[PDB]
Design a protein around this ligand. Sequence first.
Ligand SMILES: CSc1ccc(COP(C)(=O)O)cc1Nc1nc(N2C[C@H]3CNC[C@H]3C2)cc(C(F)(F)F)c1C#N
Ligand SMILES: CSc1ccc(COP(C)(=O)O)cc1Nc1nc(N2C[C@H]3CNC[C@H]3C2)cc(C(F)(F)F)c1C#N
Lengths: 298, 302
Amino acid sequence: PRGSQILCVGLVVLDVISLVDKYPKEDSEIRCLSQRWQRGGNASNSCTVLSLLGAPCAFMGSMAPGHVADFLVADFRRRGVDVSQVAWQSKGDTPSSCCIINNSNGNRTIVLHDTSLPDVSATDFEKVDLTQFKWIHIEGRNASEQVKMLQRIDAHNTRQPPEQKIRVSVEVEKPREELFQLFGYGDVVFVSKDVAKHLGFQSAEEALRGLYGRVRKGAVLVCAWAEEGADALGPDGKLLHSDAFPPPRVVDTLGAGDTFNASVIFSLSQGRSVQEALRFGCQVAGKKCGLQGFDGIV
Amino acid sequence: SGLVPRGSQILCVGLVVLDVISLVDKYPKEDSEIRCLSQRWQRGGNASNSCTVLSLLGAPCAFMGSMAPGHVADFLVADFRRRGVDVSQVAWQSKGDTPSSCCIINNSNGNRTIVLHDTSLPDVSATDFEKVDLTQFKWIHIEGRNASEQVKMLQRIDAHNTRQPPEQKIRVSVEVEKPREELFQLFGYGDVVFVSKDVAKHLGFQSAEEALRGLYGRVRKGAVLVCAWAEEGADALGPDGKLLHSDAFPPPRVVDTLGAGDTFNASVIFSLSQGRSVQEALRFGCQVAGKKCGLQGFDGIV
Ligand SMILES: CSc1ccc(COP(C)(=O)O)cc1Nc1nc(N2C[C@H]3CNC[C@H]3C2)cc(C(F)(F)F)c1C#N
Ligand SMILES: CSc1ccc(COP(C)(=O)O)cc1Nc1nc(N2C[C@H]3CNC[C@H]3C2)cc(C(F)(F)F)c1C#N
């Protein structure tokens, strides 16, 4: 149906997870509590959360034919995630990583295997019929190509009435100067704690006041700060805050940011206020932190 | 599965594990996200590695080990088949995980950090072994793990051999590679007993000669005890009391020693299974494992 789906453009990675009691010291040999294979990656994880929340969703990302992609595709389908827009690559490998999750505190150590796999381009995005989407979320990576995709969405929206415009969100998660041009695109801009700290900011309040001038007219800038909850700032100038909802036992924080992002997107897509969406994001990601994986989030 | 001729195969009973190996510039701090230089998925495990070598040496061979249905087992089974290893006797498990380890190798200093597989998968039991028709095997090699259950499997092989003529008896070998006291009862079983340098050093022995003379009294009548000592070659000792030695055949450049013990073990087993002498099998074991050390993986062992 027209204007019914939420699209997430980004990465998909096969995470081989080991759950440990204590983080291994260098040059030591420890035994894990349990092992897992999880479909991971920023946009891919957000799609999982969106499907668990009851939102019809679709993933757009690069994958290469093979047994790693075969596992990932079957998991996307198991979670009712639309994979029709996946950019299949003739050359390269589908990403895979080693994740060490500390059971005593939820810390997640990641050894990524970045592969030759080309990024999703603006020409790949050109081929996408935008009518089926109500929201499009893009994870900042190949910034110059992504700006064209965002301009395509802006152009599409100039021909639509207010109730038919596709809402857009962007995430600047890596501290790379190429990505900072993405701040000026989208209705909602998520900027990570890592990026904020690299830019010299020491709190979510400092970052939002310091970076708001970079967002486009009327946009909302969101900054999550792990156990300190999350803050948002919109055109009225009023800083909003939500305390975190930490679990009494933190066991798995892998994908907590993606859970927060998907939950804020979901709440805003349902007509909820920015203050409510901020709270809801902390509530869902807080519950995730006390669980292995994403089952049991709602 | 196809017809396997009677008394043609070499069986290795033991472990199979999926080893995810990552080469890094710097060791990752806890809760950090780093990018590795290279990643590798390798089928590992002592018995599993010996099967690979046996297939490359030209021996028909089979693996017996625990696996649980799933994606990790799917990868391992496809790798066993890639190396022509018979997996018909695998003990499939209803509960547990197929073993998998994470190895982080620091490129700047050679350090290896290992997150070892969990223990949820049950080991191959004596009741699982009872159900196996032994006629297709000429040799059975057991990797010491769940010692009390393995002793029953060894007694089953002994009983089988009491009803066979000399040319139909299945030759047996055991490996004591881990320094655990439960395993030391396995010294008294098998025609050939391999004991690792690690085990020998833990028992207070400082050379392969010290270990063989020190432990020979624990082996069964007429058995051969074998001990490899990395760059110092390898020694064997049988009932004649003569300590046999072979110098190592190191490669021009050492590249990869992972599975060198398993290569030595499979090569000694192979040579003895072909009717060669203990001295000849010892030399052959050093020659094959020496060539392996100068290669990545097992391709090119010849
Ligand atoms: C407010 S919701 C939120 C939004 C974004 C992110 C960033 O996540 P990201 C992109 O690094 O995946 C995290 C969270 N939430 C949380 N993060 C926690 N930590 C993230 C650190 C990195 N790893 C472990 C560290 C601790 C801990 C908690 C707690 F309280 F449970 F202990 C919550 C909660 N609640
Ligand atoms: C005699 S053949 C043999 C049989 C068994 C094993 C044990 O294997 P294992 C349980 O470690 O899998 C190793 C070998 N051979 C060798 N091992 C080498 N090292 C393995 C050690 C582990 N610590 C560092 C050491 C380096 C080195 C060499 C050399 F000389 F080429 F450099 C040979 C040769 N030749």
